[PDB]
């Protein structure tokens, strides 16, 4: 029907023209919990509310600090490639982390010692490209759609250093001298960037591997996240990839969280840095507790970016009928959380009772084992 | 049906879970014009995507620089009051401008010479409260819903100076000494703010007027915008209120624009300052031209805030079947625009022809008269 | 005796080594009102806690943004001159306002049209020197001690442009060419600044007046504040000097407030800008109400600087046996305040009653006339 | 010969590879006056050290805050147009001031009321375009070369809003609707900016004047600076144009200074704001006195930009055999200076003598009349 | 008697109302050394000049960047707890370092792997809590008073994340789901923070230790500083705790310095970072040498905070009859100093003589061994 911002004897009907569809998506913002209080920055933004760059071969859209100003340290691109299409050879100042949501793709990277890494990535796999190292993406026969995260919030995918753009803005006589060729031999170079372009599907990965005099890279730039054993608890699963297991991923730590219907990512905080979120599928709500009696609740669904500033308390509750699947992203060399339950469970029971004005019936339910996703009883 | 980010041979279908409802609201963002280019800051935000503060008597929600970071100089509150309900006597550093969308309300203000102004405001009326002067709002028998604009983007309606909050945080012995009463006589003062509270409807305006030894205020703090004669053109109407006619409104200039179906606010820019927008009803698109070959198109509908940074070129096209009604707001002492049509019409025809590579058939259609809203032929 | 931070059943004795003398000066900070709450910036600093620059002829010490960081827009110097001593001819970017606390002095200024103003200033008189105009101070037979206020908080009196410093760092051949003299004729110029130096007392003011071809300055740079009629109320007096009466004083508005024992500067705020304070004599306390349930109380006595950020609510209570005398300083072209009493007195009584949960016995005591200083009954 | 950084018994020969040509241009920087002292920001930059944008029809190069970081508030473009060539119709946020050094040009401007101003400007003439008003430049039969000054140091001439760029990034269907034409009628619009382009010479000015329903502009946007009577003194001339005589020029004040060989712009400072300089012809040196015993000397010649921060003491000495001609530019509504000579001349002689440790033989030479340019005797 | 700002033939008596008690505390500021010079930021602030938050169970007051703006990286709280009273379970972004001045207390901490550390701390002991890890303090039978230092100058103790505040602003249904309990079972949860609250004394430490499945923490969070062997020299003792011995203390390095009457902390500087100081007992003066001929002397006594910006030269002299005891605090992973004496002692004697214009009689007294506290002879 028609939701209204009314909670008991508080609030009133909306009397002006309104966005009913967005109101239906945001039930806990039109009607917040009575426990919310105070001014809190916006922690929510939809990729559907961004300009989509369309090219022959795919598209790209981004959520940056210009869209979500609380997220100064992290930005993200949703990129889509048709079968065989190429994201042009390029580099940038920022490190790049990726999660393959749909399909598969071949990536290349060459490091500062001239060593080559070429690999195929499928659904649930990651890559991480350190700052400044040059790379490319080419979708395979299913096409590909993936999430990129960059470790500077001011990033824009329109501002990468692309191979053909660099050459188009270098004097032809300098290019000729650089490679030992004539200007006539390079006369057919593109006059502008390609960025994303259609291409025939590549051959088998084994036939693309390039050998060289500098040997193999010491650590791989891809990771099979969903092939790892997750942390399993009553209501879902958590798969963690940070620099302790995905060795090259020095500036991005990540977790993929799945939350069954009727379950929730438990009350917790992160003692190391801010959390950046992407909602892959499902529907959620989250209250961010900001200290000094401040708290604000946000709604999220597929396509949304979320955020939790450093050490703010939070939970992520599935409020729908399907599994809730989201990413937790951190600009750090490791994942870390503190569980509210485990914290209190590891303290003397009478000390917790003195804080909460509750009795042994409550402290008896605390668990010294951390369960990141719990199920409603 | 199901829209897709495809434009001719560019783009592709979405393969990941997505927000179809938001995509349907943003057709020119999922599929932008081919004439868009480059990185442009976000210029669009919905009140439906904000936390609504619910109280006994109404609600308030806000769009600030924490939601829309391009808008550093202006912020806005959507406030609703039930019949008789009071927005508590308060003040703040920012000047406040208001447009009454629904219903009616009584306002009070007292200036720094102790002069009182009390007045009723109905649909289409404005008020403007200069910085720091204390005021209140009380809805009449229909209730009220209105848009507030404050001339600092960092404002928050949770941070005003309220009468009862001030008194609750002043020593009782100081309050007693201030007014010449005993502490017992003030023992029933509230212990916390009221902010918005239910109240019986007031009596007639004439019975509320307070006379005093300092006389009448020199200029009124309310304005009947829709009682003025608008600028009428083929496709709509523009009603302007700035410091040249609404004399007290020194830091906010405003225009209410109505655009018939099949019409558009013409191509123009503002030579004085940034534009802040509120979409009262209807559906629009706008391309913002940002210089250096950069342009980005945005979709808007009822409940949305928009923005155009200082001097960027723009138009506002009605893309729906109902009238499009929106506000243009400026932090300045006057409204000013330059019309692309009128500009070229006031130049030698051969000079315009040399720029545009078009002939007399085009310069013949230019108009030396400014028509802010034009109708498609 | 020995004060302790105990208020009823709250607080405890101090168990570590402590500053009992400062604790005795700050009773409302060691034991704040129970109505204080929350984090508020420091609003209090003593000239006695600053380095005093001693010279032959006097001294100078300063309180700047480096001492009191809330005061970004205003800084102050306490300067003392012995009889006849000269503060060297100099200029600076900042405008300068002054209050003569003790003694008397002769000032000079020359404007950008070459017009000269020379005048004597006594106790209770002011001067104001616009930005960049060059000036000097010479104490008369009693010596002089005065307060200077500069309209930039980053000012330092060690960084003025002094006549002899400029000449000492200009090539001698350029000085010679500038004035049409030989290098030998200027060989005795000082090699360094003088800043403050001893000198014989000057003659009568009438004998110093310099006539010139450009005529008299249009407005005087001195003002006899204490010769004006003050605003008198039950508990004290207020003398205001701003650009409406002290015409040249365009960027500094000022009030000298005297508060009898048992009286208080009433509850009020300023709707235009921040307040900077200097306590000339006596003892006070002030609570600053900072919005959102925040308030903090400060103690002041002779030699202290205070501050009230833009629009924060405040009062200034005399807590001693002698008159309390202080300055209110504003970076603006006029003085403005709103009185809490007068505000409520100019509203319908039942409307005030609905806010305060008090009856006609309270609204009957409100006054439509502003009384800046009230006396306890 | 070969200059060396040696001054008496100080300094030494240069032993590393060096730039002898630049050293010869900077004698007072390789060998500064012994009266210089301390760290002072760079105040000097050459247009010859900038990238020149070459187009069919002319060129443009710029000195901005990215070249000269002390100049945050002002930037400049040196622009050249061949006979008949057009600087494309455009606008920008910044106000624009211009001095015609060589040749002549026709300018157009249309204001926010649709009023047209078209005029020819010759050598020694100025124009001023207020913020955001659209304009164009077309050189006449001699071509034109001129200096532009913009009142924001972050300006870049590559970032203006150009007519054809705006249209190229606007949907064709929107352009068509805006003017009431078909998409086919506008199919020949340029696909990119023109910026500067060759064109046939225009006809007589009288034949270009466009009449309109909104009447004439109230104040002209051009000024004949060199037709005014200058301030004449022994060694040169000063022509001032600010908002008191060039009425539209509200944010830029200017003076053209000519200094004969053997003469100097006298010791002075500006009490209102920073000075920006352009050296049209000749050779100079200037010492900037920065307070606290700091001073640094700079050399300038044709093509150089200079700067003097707010209120710093300075002189400008001709150190060559030809006249020295330069511009003094200020971001303010008026020109103002204080003369060191006139300042001291308007004070009691014994008071000046007590400061300088000089006698009546020196104070006798002071002049109560201001002479901005003095001649060596 | 009555001190005056007179030094030989410089300075003068104070003629205006003044703070004699503060002047007596600041003899080297009312009458600085003649070797002081120039503008230097304030380096001194008293806890007695701060608002004291009083609660049932104790108090807390703070010195932050809002009080002492030079200290951007470090802030401090003086906290007092009555016997048995609890500082509520909480966490914050900042790391926390502590020195127990009086009494004793029990601390708890749980890390991000769920491991528990509980320990008692007495006079002269330290703790260090890494960023974001949750902790509590409970005073034992003597009560406790201690100094906290946080590694961000913008910290405020009013802004921690407290257990009961978080729960009070979390929906009850979410808390219930998180722990697997009913809303009725948690109905008695507090509605607001406790912060500090009275409580019965705890039992023996051994009975509070909580065992768990994740084992012991790898490094302890407490340190017995005064049980270590100090660096002993002629006039006092230095006890150092940094990350090389107090292993967890990664962002705070510390030294406790005791200076006998007639002794001084020698002339030295720190090559790694800024110094933050707390004066536990006694009376001192310190000159800070700031480069470029700038130096300023400050007085300190019990309860004062001091500061020395990165690498500035300094000494700390005992100017009283009792021992001087103070803390040196650094935001770094190690303590480092350079001794002026040891520096010169480790250079060729004739090279030092050429610098100082002194002979072998001076270089003969230099010591190659570092003596941090020397005694006057
Ligand atoms: Mn990339
Ligand atoms: Mn999390
Ligand atoms: Mn308001
Ligand atoms: Mn507009
Ligand atoms: Mn001065
Ligand atoms: Mn006040
Ligand atoms: Mn221009
Ligand atoms: Mn000048
Ligand atoms: Mn803590
Ligand atoms: Mn030290």
Author numbering:
A (entry chain A), B (entry chain A), C (entry chain A), D (entry chain A), E (entry chain A): 6 to 382
How does the study describe this entry?
The hexameric low-pH stress response enzyme oxalate decarboxylase catalyzes the decarboxylation of the oxalate mono-anion in the soil bacterium Bacillus subtilis. A single protein subunit contains two Mn-binding cupin domains, and catalysis depends on Mn(III) at the N-terminal site. A π-stacked tryptophan pair (W96/W274) links two neighboring protein subunits together, thus reducing the Mn-to-Mn distance from 25.9 Å (intrasubunit) to 21.5 Å (intersubunit). The present study suggests a mechanistic function for the C-terminal Mn as an electron hole donor for the N-terminal Mn.
